[PDB]
Every structure is written in C-alpha cells, then in structure tokens.
A and B are shown apart, each in its own frame.
With several copies, the nearest count.
Chain A
Amino acid sequence: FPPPP
C-alpha cells in the first residue's frame, strides 16, 4: 500500500 495522497 502506498502513502495517502
């Protein structure tokens, strides 16, 4: 999972 925008 990537970091939230």
Chain B
Amino acid sequence: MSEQSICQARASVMVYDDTSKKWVPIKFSRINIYHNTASSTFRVVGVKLQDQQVVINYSIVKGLKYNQATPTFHQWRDARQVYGLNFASKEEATTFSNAMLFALNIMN
C-alpha cells in the first residue's frame, strides 16, 4: 500500500548527454530506492534535500543494466538513455549498489 525504502544515499544525479557528448546534471540530492509490496515494484527516487523537490522517480525495470563506473560513480542504461549518480561517499555508493543489484535480482 505504502512506499517502503530499501536504502538511502547522497548523490548528484546526472544524465549522459550523447549529443553534447558530456555528462550533465538532471536539474547533492538524497537517493532512495523504494519498494511497493502491494505491486512488487522498485523505484529510484531522488529528492532535493534543499527545496525537497523530486529530481528523479525511476522504475528499475526487468532488464536494466547497472554499471559501477567508479567507487563513487555508477550508471544505468534503460534502453534509450543512461543515468549516473555521483555519490557523496564510497560507503553510500556501496550501500546503494547492493540494494540496486538486489532489487534487480528480485526484478528477475
């Protein structure tokens, strides 16, 4: 019924601009992966802990590809766009990835 978080971490969410060929900010935010038991669903929701506005609300899908580029930088391709998270700490990155991969395992 409600949204149940399975992890939380600080990161700067960015989108890879294939054209400008650069990595651009989507706008640190708080990143959480929520799960809906009443729908067996998982989402990546990033909120601006400043003005508390949601910057990202992404559904981790069935065939998603999560890549841990660096100890503090991870990305994932949906099938038509790539997202990356510049973490605030290796620790928070380690935490977010275990959840992510775990959520993806369930996703399958």
A and B touch in the complex (CB under 8 A): yes
Interface assignment of B26: CB less than 8 Å from any CB of chain A: no
Size range of the chain B interface in the assembly: 10 to 19
For A5, what are the chain B residues with a Cβ–Cβ distance below 8 Å? 14, 22-23, 73, 84, 86
Contact with B along A1-5 (1 / 0, CB 8 A): 11111
Query: Is the Cβ of A2 less than 8 Å from the Cβ of B82?
Result: yes
Taking chain B's interface residues, is the majority helix, strand, or loop, or is none over half, making it mixed? strand
Interface assignment of B41: CB less than 8 Å from any CB of chain A: no
**Choice from B65, B75, B77 contacting A4 with Cβ under 8 Å:** B75
Interface assignment of B49: CB less than 8 Å from any CB of chain A: no
Query: Is the Cβ of A1 less than 8 Å from the Cβ of B67?
Result: yes
